[PDB]
Design a binder for these strands. Structure first.
Lengths: 157, 92, 62, 228, 229, 132, 53
RNA sequence: AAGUGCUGAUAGAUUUAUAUGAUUACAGUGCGUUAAUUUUUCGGAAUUAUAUAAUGGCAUAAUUAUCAUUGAUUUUUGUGUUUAUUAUAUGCACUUGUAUGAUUAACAAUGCGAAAGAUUCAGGAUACCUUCGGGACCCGUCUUGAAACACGGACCAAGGAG
RNA sequence: AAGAUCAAGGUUAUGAUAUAAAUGUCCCAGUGGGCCACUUUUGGUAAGCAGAACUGGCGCUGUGGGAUGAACCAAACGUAA
RNA sequence: ACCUAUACAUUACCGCUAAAGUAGAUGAUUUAUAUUACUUGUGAUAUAAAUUUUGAAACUUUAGUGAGUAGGAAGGUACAA
């Protein structure tokens, strides 16, 4: 059965497309002889694609140590540790509202009544698909149950 | 200056260990026998890739020209070259 | 939970003579160059023997 | 005309090379030239050549010793195979899908919409910006970006102003925008061949009339179980 | 001609060749001696396997030679520790939590490990584990100071008088096999200081029988130890 | 402008906030000038969380960033012209910082000399003045 | 008793050429032990009814 | 149990390497020994054909220790046969090749130093304001222990005690 | 019986270690009011009581944990990722 | 499976301790070359280029560790003369 798992595990890699190996079926289903090698999952919620609909609803804390340099981020579509592992790597942005300008020409020219704080996603916080995130600034925590936004850049293949 | 033994240098340069099993170089620099085994089981990986061609080939036709087959073809060329050895070696 | 970096790590013995004497330290500097450069223990202890307090240095009679 | 190895890259310490070099091994024929020559000349007629002591003479400005050149190891791509139709998840062409034409020496991607459909130019984008979707356009028909190289799209020119040389200039040249005729011609030929292959596949989100639409992972849809 | 640079620059090319050549000859000595010990290690696994095979076929139970050589790693304090055990821990050199030394399994040692039990988890270390520890984690005691390794040459460095020992791997042979110079070899290593393994059970201060950790868990340490490095 | 002293690693000011002395915000008699709490009741001395920070050595800056002004130039208290002339060779580690007791007539000479030597002055606008 | 024994072992070993090893080593985890039935296979487990006040 | 093969992510990356100290080592590639077979079928690439040393595996022999002798295992040594594997006999030139023991930079984009003047970018619990989380009980003191429903001290300046 | 002279001795004759250890001066401060817990115990019905034995803390110790807390648990705190 | 102390691992950085060198400059050392000697290849010398004027009662270089009342020592800071 350790051998059978090894044989079964050749098959999805085969399908991917390629390196061109093993077939040893796997279902995507009609199949001529397969309900075999299983119905997904799943585990959802959404957005996804500019921005995972994401929640900054916390900081990574000790019971009473606030430790804000990393944040807990709940990705809506990620129930599971596997799903949140897709988001491991992605760049994040929190876009938020200001009364007062500030920033003039370098890239665009932003009328900076709209401010953006840019961050990257890191490792998988959750038993239930919450993820850690580092941001270049760090998010003020006035952002709590505020919608934060995760673009799918950097995606690996 | 007539009795004068030894001045020389070193500034004593400060620590960080290269761990070999993430480091190519430090595996060989220190010891070897990893190195010896390295070749044999790399060869083993190639051998198992060759049998996977043959298993796919018998069933389906298949082809056979170059992607999987270039390991088969070179493997077969090393056995025809080794066979050339056994008749030629016979007291030199 | 260092079991145990207690004591003593302050040790004992003078690196350099406890003296303002500009002459005395020149001899120390001279024999200190002669120590490792020429091996031999005569350089090693005379360097030390200049460090010596006035007590432990008591006058040798003719 | 040769002799090689080192399959050390798999192993990762090891051989083939040492062992075969021994089988071949000489024990004879060790004779050499390899002429050096300087050109430090006091060639004096009167012609008198030198150079003297320029200066490395202590205007002590402490300037940081140049950290020299890391290796050009060829940027191993992810299985983004040209032509995979892939998403630009980022920067003006945000959520527009485009087809891959090539791998260049800078590491990064050549992307064209095709242009005429989904408004994306001969435009280059990071390997990381991209989710590489399973959908494949036959990339065999193309003129290939053998002709489009790093230099080609490198800008002709951000002068700081009016061509020439120090004319005390004025606010605004064309940092992004004319456009150039050479670049138009390059697009239109490549895009035309794109359109022929792309029309074979039926309408919807992203190949031909399929191309136009602007992406939807619609509310209640999933970036994680989308096996793109 | 003699004391001045005329002879000193000659003592560049005379001795750049000499030093480099003897370093090269000792590299060949390093390779041969290293290959030899790996033949011994692989053979050592086969002897055990074959003894078991031959016995069971003849109906006979050959119960295989009781294990030498333990690795001891510190789970506990120093603070809130009884003084008998505090003293025993200093002598082992185990100064801080998750610092670990190799300790020769003797009738002498095993009694100190017993009073040290809630304070220590110990087991029989596999050769992989000893090799992972010395190359990444293994420092040297040279006049107090805790000094790299990684060089063969710096292990030849002292232990060549304990012949056949000129390599990083040859030190681990000596530890592993409980070779006669084990006292000095074990001493030469300054206690390897090791992160934490992997989900290391809440109950902590219970004998391994009770699901604890702490104990001679025997062969099950190999899983633990490999992860902790 | 003025060319910065000798390639520094970025100056970590590591704790920036003036240590302020315990209860200076309680009392105007207790001066912001730090005085260590020796006293048996101190929650500060036993370093409970949330009782500020006591100057502990580990806030200590790198011995490379020691003294450097962030435009590089370490402070040399320049009494006059001859004093300025010391830092002629040492442009790239030191700045002339005109002592407050120095009159304008001499300051004009100091500033003028400073431009010749090309050594930074931190304060020129010192004592200037729409005045006689 | 040790001096006299050490001198005997030394002499005996030297006349055997090699080797001495006269220093006392405490009881080590011993040996590959073969148990032959003989005199019959084992087995018997144990216990318990241990009530009885 | 095998670096057999391999991917992602995270944080770090002192680099004054001549303050008064190293830059050395290896590897690739080219050079000029040949042949044969094979693959691509162009450029090339691999394996086989030597001597030396070591090692494993076969057979044989001796010792020494051991489980028991049917048969095995050990340490040591020698010998014969064949085969595989590995190292040495592989120098010199060049090299943005690997490391050189804190090896972050190839490559590139952007802001911009735009004379004085001065834009733009980055960065900051100065004072202090704001917004969010978490933490912060009153010091001095005698006392086992002080936030104490223990004692002095409204507040501030200056004299003021080893 | 000592002092002891002379000749003989394969491997120094349990095991880890040594943060180097030993030794002297100051006659140095501070202390001479302890408190608590495992275990062992005496007086007392008992006590957050009076008093020992061994050992650790607290005294001089926060931090994390026991919601809380001088002392129990885990752990001894340069500054940060 | 997950969460998490100033604990634990690594790294930069502070300090303290440790451990080592540093002190031919009418000289030394590196680099390139021309000449000469020997030899394949090295040194000598000439020339050109470059580095080096060290609070050597400190620096360069290194590693291990840091609670702390009473108290002790060490080194500064401020104030008047």
């Amino acid at each position: 059965m350790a051998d059978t798992q090894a044989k079964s595990t050749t098959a999805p890699k085969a399908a991917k497309a390629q390196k061109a190996p093993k077939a040893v079926k796997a279902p995507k289903a009609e199949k001529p002889a397969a309900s075999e090698a299983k119905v997904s999952a799943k585990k959802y919620k959404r957005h996804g694609r500019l921005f995972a609909k994401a929640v900054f609803t916390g900081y990574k804390r000790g019971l009473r140590n606030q430790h804000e340099n990393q944040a807990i981020l709940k990705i809506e579509g990620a129930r599971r540790k596997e799903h949140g592992s897709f988001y491991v790597g992605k760049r994040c942005v929190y876009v938020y509202k200001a009364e007062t300008k500030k920033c003039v020409p370098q890239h665009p020219e932003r009328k900076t009544r709209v401010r953006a704080v840019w961050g990257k996603v890191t490792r998988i916080h959750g038993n239930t698909g919450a993820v850690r995130a580092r941001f270049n600034r760090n998010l003020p925590g006035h952002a709590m149950g505020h919608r934060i936004r995760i673009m799918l850049y950097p995606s690996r293949i | 200056r007539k009795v004068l033994r030894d001045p020389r240098k070193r500034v004593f340069r400060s620590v960080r260990r290269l761990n070999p099993l993430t480091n190519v170089r430090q595996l060989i620099k220190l010891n070897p026998y990893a190195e010896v085994l390295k070749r044999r089981a790399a060869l083993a990986a190639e051998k198992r890739t060759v049998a996977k061609v043959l298993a796919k080939a018998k069933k389906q036709n298949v082809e056979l020209a170059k992607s999987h087959f270039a390991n088969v073809a070179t493997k077969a060329a090393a056995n025809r070259a080794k066979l050339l050895a056994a008749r030629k070696k016979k007291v030199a | 939970g260092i079991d145990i970096n207690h004591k003593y790590d302050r040790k004992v013995r003078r690196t350099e003579p406890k003296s303002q004497d500009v002459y005395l330290r020149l001899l120390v500097k001279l024999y200190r160059f002669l120590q490792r450069r020429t091996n031999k223990k005569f350089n090693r202890i005379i360097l030390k023997r200049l460090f010596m307090s006035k007590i432990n240095r008591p006058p040798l009679s003719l | 005309k040769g002799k090689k190895h080192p399959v050390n890259s798999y192993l990762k310490g090891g051989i083939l090379r040492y062992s075969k070099a021994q089988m071949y091994k000489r024990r004879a024929l060790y004779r050499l030239k390899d002429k050096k020559s300087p050109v430090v000349e006091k060639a004096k007629v009167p012609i008198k050549k030198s150079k003297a002591s320029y200066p490395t003479k202590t205007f002590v400005k402490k300037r940081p010793s140049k950290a020299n050149f890391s290796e050009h190891k060829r940027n191993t791509r992810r299985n983004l195979t040209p032509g995979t139709v892939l998403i630009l998840l980022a920067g003006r062409h945000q959520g527009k899908r485009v087809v891959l034409l090539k791998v260049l020496a800078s590491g990064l991607l050549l992307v064209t919409g095709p242009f005429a459909l989904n408004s994306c130019p001969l435009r280059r984008v990071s390997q990381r910006y991209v989710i590489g979707t399973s959908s494949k356009v036959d990339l065999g028909a193309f003129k290939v970006p053998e002709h489009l190289n790093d230099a080609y799209f490198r800008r002709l020119k951000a002068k700081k102003d009016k061509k020439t040389g120090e004319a005390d200039i004025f606010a605004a040249k064309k940092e992004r925008f004319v456009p150039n005729e050479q670049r138009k011609k390059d697009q239109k030929e490549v895009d035309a061949a794109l359109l022929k292959v792309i029309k074979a596949h039926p309408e919807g989100k992203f190949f031909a009339k399929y191309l136009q639409n602007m992406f939807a992972l619609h509310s209640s849809q999933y970036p994680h179980r989308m096996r793109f | 001609f003699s004391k001045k640079q005329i002879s000193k620059r000659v003592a560049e090319s005379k001795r750049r060749l000499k030093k480099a050549a003897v370093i090269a000859l000792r590299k060949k000595e390093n390779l041969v001696r290293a290959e030899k010990y790996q033949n011994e290690y692989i053979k050592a696994e086969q002897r055990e396997i074959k003894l078991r095979r031959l016995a069971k076929k003849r109906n006979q139970f050959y119960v295989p030679a009781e294990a030498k050589l333990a690795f001891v790693v510190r789970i506990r304090g120093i603070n809130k520790v009884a003084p008998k055990v505090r003293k025993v821990l200093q002598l082992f050199r185990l100064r801080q939590i998750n610092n670990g030394v190799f300790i020769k399994l003797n009738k002498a040692t095993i009694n100190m490990l017993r009073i040290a039990e809630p304070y220590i988890t110990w087991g029989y270390p596999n050769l992989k584990s000893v090799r992972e520890l010395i190359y990444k984690r293994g420092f040297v005691k040279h006049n107090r100071q805790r000094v790299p390794i990684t060089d063969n040459f710096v292990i030849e460095r002292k232990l060549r008088q304990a012949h056949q020992i000129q390599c990083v791997e040859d030190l681990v042979h000596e530890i592993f096999t409980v070779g006669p110079n084990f006292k000095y070899a074990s001493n030469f290593l300054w206690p390897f200081k090791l992160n934490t393994p992997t989900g290391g059970w809440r109950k902590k201060a219970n004998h391994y029988v009770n699901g604890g950790d702490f104990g001679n868990r025997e062969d099950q340490i190999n899983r633990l130890l490999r992860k902790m490095v | 402008m003025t060319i910065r002293p000798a390639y520094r690693p970025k100056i970590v000011k590591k704790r920036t906030k003036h240590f302020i002395r315990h209860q200076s915000d309680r009392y105007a008699k207790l001066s912001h000038k730090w005085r260590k709490p020796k006293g048996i009741d101190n929650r500060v001395r036993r370093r409970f969380k949330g009782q500020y920070l006591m100057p502990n050595i580990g806030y200590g800056s790198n011995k490379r960033t020691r003294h450097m002004l962030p435009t590089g130039f370490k402070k040399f208290l320049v009494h006059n012209v001859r004093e300025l002339e010391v830092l002629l060779m040492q442009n790239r580690v030191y700045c002339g910082e005109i002592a407050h007791g120095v009159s304008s007539k001499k300051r004009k000479e100091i500033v003028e000399r400073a431009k010749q030597l090309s050594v930074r002055l931190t304060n020129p606008n010192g004592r200037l003045r729409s005045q006689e | 008793r040790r001096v006299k024994e050490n001198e005997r072992l030394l002499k005996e070993a030297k006349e055997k050429g090699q080797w001495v090893s006269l220093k006392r080593q405490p009881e080590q985890p011993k040996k590959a032990h073969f148990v032959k039935k003989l005199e019959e296979p084992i087995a018997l487990a144990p216990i318990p009814y241990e009530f009885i006040a």
